[PDB]
Amino acid sequence: SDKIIHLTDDSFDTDVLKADGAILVDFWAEWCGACKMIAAILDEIADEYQGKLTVAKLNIDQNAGTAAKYGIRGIPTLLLFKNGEVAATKVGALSKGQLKEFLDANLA
């Protein structure tokens, strides 16, 4: 978790909306089973993609305002931001390989 940005309602603007480049935000909660595998994959992704992609987490139980703003309906949900705007989303569990091709799909 050393390479994952911890987001809240109060840091989201600065850390995501005003951030240059790509940020992958993981919307999660402790009660979400599928979110645990997502977390392990994301640690590897954050490491492998350092300097190309920032990875972050937003707990929806603790930050319902942000969850509502982005229309989160179920978790896990991954939101990919580029220069402060939503570029892509993926709802529900996926494999590491699938996440890599989802990321590749969003290359300029």
1 contacts Cu ion (rule: CB under 5 A): yes
CB atoms within 10 A of CB 82: 15
Q: Is 35 a catalytic residue?
A: yes
Cα(3)–Cα(14) distance, integer angstroms: 17
- 22-28 and 77-82 strand pairing: antiparallel
2 contacts Cu ion (rule: CB under 5 A): yes
104 contacts Cu ion (rule: CB under 5 A): no
- Could you tell me how many residues of this chain bind Cu ion (CB under 5 A)? 2
Options 1-9, 15-23, 26-34, 68-76: segment touching Cu ion (CB under 5 A): 1-9
Which residue has its beta carbon closest to Cu ion?
A: 2
Cα(3)–Cα(95) distance, integer angstroms: 20
Q: Is 21 a catalytic residue?
A: no
Binding site for Cu ion (CB under 5 A): 1-2
Catalytic residues, by residue number, are 32, 35
